[PDB]
Amino acid sequence: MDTSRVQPIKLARVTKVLGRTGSQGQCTQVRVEFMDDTSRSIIRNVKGPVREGDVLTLLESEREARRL
Amino acid sequence: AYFQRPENALKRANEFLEVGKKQPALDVLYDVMKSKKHRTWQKIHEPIMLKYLELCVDLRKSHLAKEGLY
Amino acid sequence: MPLAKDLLHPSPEEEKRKHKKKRLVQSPNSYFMDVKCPGCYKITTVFSHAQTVVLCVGCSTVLCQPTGGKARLTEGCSFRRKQH
Amino acid sequence: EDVQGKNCLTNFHGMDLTRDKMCSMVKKWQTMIEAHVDVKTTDGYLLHLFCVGFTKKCNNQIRKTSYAQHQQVRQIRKKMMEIMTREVQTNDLKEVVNKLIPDSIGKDIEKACQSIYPLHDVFVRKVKMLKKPKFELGKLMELHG
Amino acid sequence: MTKKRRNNGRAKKGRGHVQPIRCTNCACCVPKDKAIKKFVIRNIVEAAAVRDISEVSVFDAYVLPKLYVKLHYCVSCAIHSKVVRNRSREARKDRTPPPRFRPAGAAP
Amino acid sequence: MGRVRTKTVKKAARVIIEKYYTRLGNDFHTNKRVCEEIAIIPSKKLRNKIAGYVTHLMKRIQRGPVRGISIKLQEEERERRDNYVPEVSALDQEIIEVDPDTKEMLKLLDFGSLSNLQVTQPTVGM
Amino acid sequence: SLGPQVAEGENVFGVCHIFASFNDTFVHVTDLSGKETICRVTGGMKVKADRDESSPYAAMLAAQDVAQRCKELGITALHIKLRATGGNRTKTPGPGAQSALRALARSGMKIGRIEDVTPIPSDSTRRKGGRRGRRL
Amino acid sequence: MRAKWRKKRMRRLKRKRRKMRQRSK
RNA sequence: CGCAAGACGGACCAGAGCGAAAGCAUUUGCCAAGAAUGUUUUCAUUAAUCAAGAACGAAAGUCGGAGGUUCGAAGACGAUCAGAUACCGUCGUAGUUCCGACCAUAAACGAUGCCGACUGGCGAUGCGGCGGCGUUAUUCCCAUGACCCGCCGGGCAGCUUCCGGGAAACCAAAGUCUUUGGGUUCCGGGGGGAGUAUGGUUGCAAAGCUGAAACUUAAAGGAAUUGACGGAAGGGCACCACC
């Protein structure tokens, strides 16, 4: 009725980098492992320069990337 | 694909028998004994072969009881 | 074609497997036959492509059947050409 | 059809089939074969069954087609009606259902048409109960006995 | 008058008229023999959501159904969506379909 | 980065290995000093390159034969494969028999020995 | 909110009726029969912009609420029926089909079955747009 | 389209001449 | 969840089939018609192409009735634009459908007359006939079914090349042409003026068919080749480009 009830702050880590996307190469596709489930994996779009094995701070895993 | 839990062969086999068809109910039973389901004796393979050889002798098919036992 | 081949004298059936009006002499591809089954104990003579029912005078009253070409006989042997 | 003290009793109304199964069987280089009949039971129930057949991709074709003549098809349709009227005109409402659950009906057609073209697949994609008789409480409770 | 293609860009042989089909994207009328036909078989569920659906499903091993869509494109929509590309004079004679993955197993 | 070797290096590198195969080691420094004595390379930086490629080739020449240049011992083993192979000395195993329709040819050409019969089924792919 | 008097080892199965395509997403949870029903939420109610009504997160945010009121009542499991628009139209799912499932499943609700249902003609009336169709 | 229009403007013009001559008599 | 109305035959449906062409896909029956193949049947030159004349002939349109779901010229609105009588969104008449009369036109395109003869190779597909080592159906066994292999007709097409031709693109025909002649019909003469003028004819209407000149001009046009250009496609690159 009022506002919303939301999920708590998640943490998920890179397994591999895929390639860069966006219309100036500013976005980066990446595969990430959920860091609580080792068989779960989602693809994301991440802005900043990333290497591999570093951890992110996802606000949701409802969202999922495709290409555009 | 086909089947799963190879135990479904009995169900069909049983379903066709309530109509009175032992020619296809059996076929379904044989379609399993010979297939990817060669996991050497799951516990359900005995009731399959017991029904299979009952129908073989209920219609008279030795060359099928041979392949079944083989 | 090897572009030098003979045409005077052809092979017995490797150059007489051709269509019958594309041969050097025109031959039929049909024949007669002397029959005499039991259903009708008589020496009947019948053409290979019957085109019509051939009748019998015995217990039977049918011998042939006209299909789309040759003719399907029956349970009675009786066969010959003879010669042609 | 009836309510009885917080328990709702049911009655047959007709069967249908999924989409994906019906779609997956349909494919290029086959000839689809279809027919229906209107049919009456021994009782007052009336049904309108819809069946289907598909041609077989044959034993050891090197050909990339499985198409059939038009003459051959109209035989297969005629013989698919003949079977499905014999087994449903006789044999009351419940015995119909009993034959369709393992699919004995469809399997019987597959072998009976085998000589004039082998065929793999027979299913009854729909049945539509069109008319039905009176409630008949005595006949009703037989089903829930 | 120069003839770019022996087939005039369609599969009409020994026939006077062919029923038109509507393009899936732009609704334009296109002859059934000129339309670019793509059969798309997809799982109803996307590969990422398969795990969550298997964990929440009451059945231990549910076989997920497939969507069967026959897409019909006009030539313009098929070029814009990059379904068909421009080919050289010689490579237009080639009718081999481009190789896809390999096969319908696993990753693709 | 970059620094893909030019043709001037790859031309003379092959030549220098063919005619001074023996002098080569597999160390950089030794292969440098040899190239300095068996030829003059008019630059210093050029010399440091041609040595390094001569080294990199000599690694592969100690495996199977290179297809850009020849050495003597490979043409030895070439000759040794190409004058007898250990597989046969017999022709082919001395007796091989054939199936009919070949026998009919041989019947009409005065031969009538060393045959078998099998009359394999009809037909192509069937 | 009063549920049934047992659901301890069994589940109660509703039907989810997810709607697909563009400019709209519905999620409308009903009975097994579908005769009567419960809450019904749209992506135009979660997000107001008249252009994010078909977006993934708008479909997820919808089902993230609807799935609460299910379990609040006693509906714990869901059979799923899909609907793309069809009727000689696009006849292909929108974006917010994949989306809502991923969100509602992980919220805690069980999934029982899933299927495609779309109204597909056996050839029917002419489609809006004319012979030359839309351009620009 | 261009030629099909040039044939059309001259069609309506021809029709007008017919009417105008039929009007004159 | 049930009912009504009108429209329409998906996927299956293909360089597949049938028809003179225009065209022709739900079931079952009836009515007449036709091609190909088979034949040691019949007739005995009965043929080929065509002024006159004749039948059929998409869609739109016209006249009189029925019907009118859907789409929709016209028209009324909402946006976009300096302008926007447009592209886009909403509504919507005629029309779209059926019955009976008219209208004779299309990129009615293979932009390729019809009939006949001769001249390469190869693999397929639809139909008929014939020949065959075998699997396969059933009643247990050569009824005729499916699959395999080969052969003979005519049909829609494809691949291949120093057949030969062509300006080239291309084409086993557009080939067998200065080494020119198998038979026959129709039709063309630089570009505009003009399918206009005019008279004839047909039509209820809309128009169709038949069809000039005065005057003007040295180019119009084809393939074909090389460049440049593209709000064409695929790769690659730059802080004088961007992030």
UniProtKB/Swiss-Prot annotation, chain C:
Presence of keyword Nucleus: yes
InterPro entries: Ribosomal_eS27, Ribosomal_eS27_Zn-bd_dom_sf, Ribosomal_zn-bd
Segments of skewed composition (Basic and acidic residues): 1-16
Coiled coil regions in record: none
C4-type zinc finger segments: 37-59
Region (Disordered): 1-23
Signal peptide boundaries: none
Phosphoserine modifications at: 11
Any single GO BP term: rRNA processing
Family: Belongs to the eukaryotic ribosomal protein eS27 family.
Function noted in UniProt: Component of the small ribosomal subunit. The ribosome is a large ribonucleoprotein complex responsible for the synthesis of proteins in the cell. Required for proper rRNA processing and maturation of 18S rRNAs. Part of the small subunit (SSU) processome, first precursor of the small eukaryotic ribosomal subunit.
The protein's name: Small ribosomal subunit protein eS27
Species name: Oryctolagus cuniculus
Highest classification ranks of the organism: Eukaryota, Metazoa, Chordata, Craniata, Vertebrata
UniProtKB/Swiss-Prot annotation, chain E:
Subunit structure: Component of the 40S small ribosomal subunit.
Any one Gene Ontology molecular-function term assigned to this protein's record: mRNA binding
Binding site for Zn(2+): 23, 26, 74, 77
Species assigned in the record: Oryctolagus cuniculus (Rabbit)
Name this protein carries in UniProt: Small ribosomal subunit protein eS26
Modified residues (Phosphoserine): 54
Chain spans, region Disordered: 85-108
Origin: domain of life: Eukaryota
Gene coding for it: RPS26
GO cellular component, one term: rough endoplasmic reticulum
GO biological processes: translation
Intracellular or extracellular location(s): Cytoplasm, Cytosol; Cytoplasm; Rough endoplasmic reticulum
Gene3D superfamilies, A to Z: Ribosomal protein S26e
Biased composition (Pro residues): 98-108
Species classification: Eukaryota, Metazoa, Chordata, Craniata, Vertebrata
Known function: Component of the small ribosomal subunit. The ribosome is a large ribonucleoprotein complex responsible for the synthesis of proteins in the cell.
Family according to the record: Belongs to the eukaryotic ribosomal protein eS26 family.
Bias kind Basic and acidic residues: ranges: 87-97
InterPro entries according to UniProt: Ribosomal_eS26, Ribosomal_eS26_CS, Ribosomal_eS26_sf
Pfam families per record: Ribosomal_S26e (PF01283)
UniProt keyword annotations, A-Z: Cytoplasm, Endoplasmic reticulum, Phosphoprotein, Ribonucleoprotein, Ribosomal protein, Zinc
UniProtKB/Swiss-Prot annotation, chain F:
Keywords: Cytoplasm, Isopeptide bond, Nucleus, Phosphoprotein, Ribonucleoprotein, Ribosomal protein, Ubl conjugation
Covalent crosslink: Glycyl lysine isopeptide (Lys-Gly) (interchain with G-Cter in SUMO2): 103
Tree of life domain: Eukaryota
Family: Belongs to the eukaryotic ribosomal protein eS17 family.
Chain positions of cross-link Glycyl lysine isopeptide (Lys-Gly) (interchain with G-Cter in SUMO1): 103
GO biological process: translation
Residue numbers of Phosphoserine PTMs: 113
Sequence positions bearing N6-succinyllysine: 19
GO cellular component: cytosolic ribosome; nucleolus; ribonucleoprotein complex
Oligomer status and interactors: Component of the small ribosomal subunit. Part of the small subunit (SSU) processome, composed of more than 70 proteins and the RNA chaperone small nucleolar RNA (snoRNA) U3.
Protein name in UniProt: Small ribosomal subunit protein eS17
InterPro entries listed in its UniProt record: Ribosomal_eS17, Ribosomal_eS17_CS, Ribosomal_eS17_sf
Keyword match Phosphoprotein: yes
Localization terms from the record: Cytoplasm; Nucleus, Nucleolus
GO molecular function term, any single one: structural constituent of ribosome
Function: Component of the small ribosomal subunit. The ribosome is a large ribonucleoprotein complex responsible for the synthesis of proteins in the cell. Part of the small subunit (SSU) processome, first precursor of the small eukaryotic ribosomal subunit. During the assembly of the SSU processome in the nucleolus, many ribosome biogenesis factors, an RNA chaperone and ribosomal proteins associate with the nascent pre-rRNA and work in concert to generate RNA folding, modifications, rearrangements and cleavage as well as targeted degradation of pre-ribosomal RNA by the RNA exosome.
Listed PANTHER family: 40S RIBOSOMAL PROTEIN S17 (PTHR10732:SF0)
Source organism: Oryctolagus cuniculus
From Swiss-Prot, chain H:
Keywords assigned by UniProt, alphabetized: Cytoplasm, Ribonucleoprotein, Ribosomal protein
Region feature (Disordered): 1-25
One of the protein's GO biological processes: translation
Protein name per UniProt: Small ribosomal subunit protein eS32
Species assigned in the record: Oryctolagus cuniculus (Rabbit)
GO MF terms held by the record: structural constituent of ribosome
Disulfide bonds: none
Subcellular location: Cytoplasm
Family, similarity comment: Belongs to the eukaryotic ribosomal protein eS32 family.
A GO CC annotation given for this chain: cytoplasm
UniProt entry tagged with the keyword Cell division: no
Function according to Swiss-Prot or TrEMBL: Component of the small ribosomal subunit. The ribosome is a large ribonucleoprotein complex responsible for the synthesis of proteins in the cell. Interacts with the beta subunit of protein kinase CKII and stimulates phosphorylation of DNA topoisomerase II alpha by CKII.
Lineage, opening ranks: Eukaryota, Metazoa, Chordata, Craniata, Vertebrata
Gene for this chain: RPL41
Self-association and partners: Component of the small ribosomal subunit.
Keyword check for Lyase: no
